[PDB]
Design a protein around this ligand. Structure first.
Ligand SMILES: *[C@@H]1O[C@H](CO)[C@@H](O[C@@H]2O[C@H](CO)[C@@H](O)[C@H](O)[C@H]2NC(C)=O)[C@H](O)[C@H]1NC(C)=O
Ligand SMILES: *[C@@H]1O[C@H](CO)[C@@H](O[C@@H]2O[C@H](CO)[C@@H](O)[C@H](O)[C@H]2NC(C)=O)[C@H](O)[C@H]1NC(C)=O
Ligand SMILES: *[C@@H]1O[C@H](CO)[C@@H](O[C@@H]2O[C@H](CO)[C@@H](O)[C@H](O)[C@H]2NC(C)=O)[C@H](O)[C@H]1NC(C)=O
Ligand SMILES: *[C@@H]1O[C@H](CO)[C@@H](O[C@@H]2O[C@H](CO)[C@@H](O)[C@H](O)[C@H]2NC(C)=O)[C@H](O)[C@H]1NC(C)=O
Ligand SMILES: *[C@@H]1O[C@H](CO)[C@@H](O)[C@H](O)[C@H]1NC(C)=O
Ligand SMILES: *[C@@H]1O[C@H](CO)[C@@H](O)[C@H](O)[C@H]1NC(C)=O
Lengths: 534, 534
């Protein structure tokens, strides 16, 4: 006992590993367990704290990834595979990873990354999530947590103690509880913890901001291209229950009682559930996953919207934003006429089915309303305009406008909001041009991959990435992304009245106001009133 | 018998008068009667052909103007008074005026002007309608007709033979019948007659294009800032009847039967009806007149829309268009916050009541839909943007979009359509700047007033006016406003597929396509579907 890679925690001793980083080295503790393996009769159950172990836990290699659907649309294509599980998949997947500056800090800023993946996929071990560039460059202790996705993490039979719903959010919470209790031994300050995540991870961050049972475990938050109120991020208990039985219906399950259904589902091998999980969503849409958080009355006391209206949430500072072309990925994967290798010019016909796919809960009138809002009537048959119009529709409706709604509601009660719009397309992007500044592609800059030359980024991209990493880290440490007395351009606070935000790219910073207001007033105010009335 | 000012017609002989024009002279026959005086028991009745007279009818001075509301909002202001009656008003007002080139033509092009005035006002004798500049410059026989307006011309008790409705349209028709029968003696060609009018006059022209009983009396048509389908231009028989009894209710009338009501109304002096006529419209709106054409099953066989859809109308060539700021006059006179001498910056509050006033038949959802379509959300509190947005709303909804609807329907079955957008603001306009290119102000150029120097127009304005007068006259004569083999820029035909139109101003001609499509798809397609659904 006593060496830089050896850390003693309230759960037992762990042994890290030295890792190289930009010509220096840091410590890494990978695969530390924070919960009991959720296997056997534990499948679908709330997680349990990991029982302490004696001896030294070997924390030198990445853990297994949770059972999930694996994307095979482009076998060999790095653009899609960099998001697939890079470790063996297993239900025994509740571990976290920590990158620690060398020599070990005494009490420094802590950042906990929550991965995205639409609540049905995701891994903490992905190369784009490697925490070392950030820990090393910003001197922050970097944590990577994990959580059950799909049915494993979200099957919901409300009322049952065996499959209550939201267990994957509870998994995250448990990891946050562990960091709270032990990050000090790794030299991290448990009083200055910032949770950040992208897409479902950004939504998760917001759900922890809302949930009373989570608010006390962290200090501040960063949300990237995701909000807890996103339309794809949560369902009612009635709906969860319906999907859970439909899932049992696909696996030839006895459906007479929750106990019967649950018993059957715990019997199936993981892959059996994954093979049929896309058959349960009851309507056709851009998004085809069924298992997500439920508004249960516990993790979420009431509707997300009423909580937002009344200020029922953690008041603190937040930093959040979106990418310019949030919708392109979803279209590529779920809308007809979009392909990876063509320019995907869209027939006015494929355009109409595209909007239906995008606003599945709309009636005809609402479908017309969306169509009119996004159509250039002077040139309604332009295939590129139809393609980009659909890109905007999907991005606005599912990511950007829900986030602008969240930010405007939050700012009214919060203690400081910083908003960004990332619109720099990476020079080395392997995805087609028509996709633009793609959902997910700001992550590589948040994690500093552009500082690794072999990755072929440009010099200005390495500069953008350092500016970004420093904004994230300065904000996590102080609640402001700006250097006190620096002489760099200032990222202003987003306020209720001015609603300022900054672009995030390679050119001189520029401040703007009311990010996509024209479209978001339509999605957040008009369209809903239209559908409630009609 | 035999002299240039003496003309013998099937109704008797008439004696004209020589009139000076741009340093030359022409003949003018003013105040020729085409119907019996619609007085006494004839009030509200269909007109009767004028009984032939013996002797010579003195046609040297302007006739009386029909009984109408007189605008007194700006006593002394020439801008409003140039539209008021300039002759004594009288129920005995069914006369027409003819300007004839000297020496008398043998068989030349004839143009018949139908005045506008919202179906409650208007005179054929106005100085802006003086036919001499056009007759002289284009060698056309120019006719000016007249017709009863207000209750006198439109009180409608459908089913009654005493007050059937549309008598003012019948008045026009009778004048067209007279021109058809006698214009040859004045040297005009009855085979080449073009009816043209502005605002209610443009609507009238279109109603004659629709009405079977009128189609045979003319060859082609020009419509200026008015369409028969304008929302202010017609009512149902049920509604006409309701307004007629409400009118009787304001004059203490026995309301037990049509005969009783009608008897009472024929008893009142003209001014008694005019004094209370603005009290009958049942809702608050920008427009406050109640007496207009009725869809009666006779003059109009069926709904204007079904007639348009099925091609039930005269197939021929049409020339029509709008002014850029069709809505400013209506706002000045009927919306709060608009004044002749201020810039009329509009409070976001005065903006909301403005839209309600403008789309009186809309529910809340429809009111929101209009508001969203015209609001710049980046700068929603800009008083000039609110002022101009309202200008557009009123102009689009009441003049421009109804006309684009008419033109697109007509062109499908017609034999040639020419479309214009007049956007030149007269250099000498006496109305405030905020009003822009005002509804009604293209008339002075159609009638060639800019050729009279003392009127203080610029040299290019005299040029624009000659180009316009020549387009109107060439089109009336041939059905094409262009000179066969000229080398001037070509005004293209408006076709179903390309929808081309030209700007009409002092700069080199410019061709555009789909005049205000973005807004008109909203007013002609979306808003209606929205209100039918909700
Ligand atoms: C965030 O919260 C802090 C403290 O709750 C705010 O600072 C206080 O500001 C008020 C009025 O400006 C003063 O009366 C207090 O003395 C301040 N307290 C401290 C510790 O400075 C701060 O303004 C809030 N920031 C935002 C952006 O809402
Ligand atoms: C950085 O750019 C180089 C230059 O093209 C990439 O190298 C090519 O990679 C493909 C696939 O591995 C090979 O078929 C070619 O032979 C390589 N060409 C050269 C000139 O080396 C390299 O893959 C890029 N780096 C990364 C991490 O993508
Ligand atoms: C207007 O109508 C005329 C005649 O009804 C059209 O001219 C005819 O065009 C067709 C096909 O182009 C020919 O078969 C006939 O020989 C033509 N008749 C004459 C007298 O030329 C004319 O094309 C129509 N114009 C528009 C714009 O619809
Ligand atoms: C053309 O412009 C002249 C120049 O201002 C106008 O003349 C003025 O008219 C007002 C009202 O009649 C008088 O009070 C001024 O004394 C006139 N000034 C001059 C210098 O003559 C004239 O009215 C305009 N013509 C028309 C038809 O409006
Ligand atoms: C930890 O695991 C790695 C690889 O599995 C191995 O090389 C190393 O020796 C292990 N250390 C201990 C103390 O077991
Ligand atoms: C016609 O009327 C005008 C004015 O009313 C008069 O000067 C003229 O002499 C009249 N002519 C005849 C023949 O009555």
């Amino acid at each position: 006992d006593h060496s830089e890679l050896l850390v003693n925690t309230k759960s037992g001793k762990v042994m890290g590993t030295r890792v190289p980083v930009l010509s220096s080295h840091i410590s890494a503790f990978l695969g530390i367990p924070f919960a009991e393996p959720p296997v056997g009769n534990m499948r679908f159950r709330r997680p349990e704290p990991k029982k302490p172990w004696s001896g030294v836990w070997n924390a030198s290699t990445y853990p297994n990834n949770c059972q999930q659907y694996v994307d095979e649309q482009f076998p060999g294509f790095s653009g899609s595979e960099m998001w697939n599980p890079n470790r063996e998949m297993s239900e025994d997947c509740l571990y976290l990873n920590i990158w620690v500056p060398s020599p070990r800090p005494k009490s420094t800023t802590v950042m906990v990354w929550i991965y995205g993946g639409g609540f049905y996929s995701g891994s903490s071990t992905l190369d784009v999530y490697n925490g070392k560039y950030l820990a090393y460059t910003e001197e922050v202790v970097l944590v990577s947590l994990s959580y059950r996705v799909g049915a494993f993490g979200f099957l919901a039979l409300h009322g049952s103690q065996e499959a209550p719903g939201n267990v994957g959010l509870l998994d995250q919470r448990m990891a946050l509880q562990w960091v709270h209790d032990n990050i000090q031994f790794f030299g991290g300050d448990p009083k200055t913890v910032t949770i950040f995540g992208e897409s479902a991870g950004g939504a998760s961050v917001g759900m922890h901001i809302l949930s009373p049972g989570s608010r006390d475990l962290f200090r501040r938050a960063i949300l990237q291209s995701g909000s807890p109120n996103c339309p794809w991020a949560s369902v009612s208990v009635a709906e969860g229950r319906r999907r859970a039985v439909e899932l049992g219906r696909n696996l030839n399950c006895n459906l007479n009682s929750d106990e019967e259904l649950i018993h059957c589902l715990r019997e199936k091998k993981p892959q059996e559930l994954i093979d049929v999980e896309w058959n349960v969503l009851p309507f056709d849409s851009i998004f085809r996953f069924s298992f997500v958080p439920v508004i249960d009355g516990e993790f979420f006391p009431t509707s997300l919207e009423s909580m937002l209206n009344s200020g029922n949430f953690k008041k603190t500072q937040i930093l959040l934003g979106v990418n310019k072309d949030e919708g392109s990925f979803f279209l590529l994967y779920g809308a007809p006429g979009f392909s990876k290798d063509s320019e995907s010019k869209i027939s006015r016909e494929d355009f109409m089915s595209g909007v239906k796919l995008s606003v599945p809960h709309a009636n005809d009138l609402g479908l017309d309303a969306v169509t009119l809002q996004y159509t250039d009537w002077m040139d309604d048959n332009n295939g590129i305009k139809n393609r980009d119009g659909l890109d905007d529709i999907v991005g606005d409706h599912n990511v950007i406008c829900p986030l602008m709604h969240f930010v405007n509601k939050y700012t009214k009660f919060g203690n400081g909001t910083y908003l960004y719009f990332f619109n720099h397309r990476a020079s080395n992007l392997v995805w087609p041009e028509w996709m633009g500044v793609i959902h997910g592609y700001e992550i590589e800059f948040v994690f500093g991959l552009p500082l690794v030359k072999e990755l072929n980024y440009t010099a200005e991209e390495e500069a953008l990435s350092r500016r970004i990493m420093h904004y994230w880290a300065t904000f996590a440490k102080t609640g402001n992304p700006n250097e006190p007395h620096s002489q760099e351009s200032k990222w202003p606070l987003f306020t209720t009245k001015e609603q300022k935000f900054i672009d995030l790219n390679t050119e001189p910073m520029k401040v703007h106001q009311r990010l996509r207001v024209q479209m978001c007033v339509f999605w957040n105010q008009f369209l809903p009133k239209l559908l409630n009335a009609t």
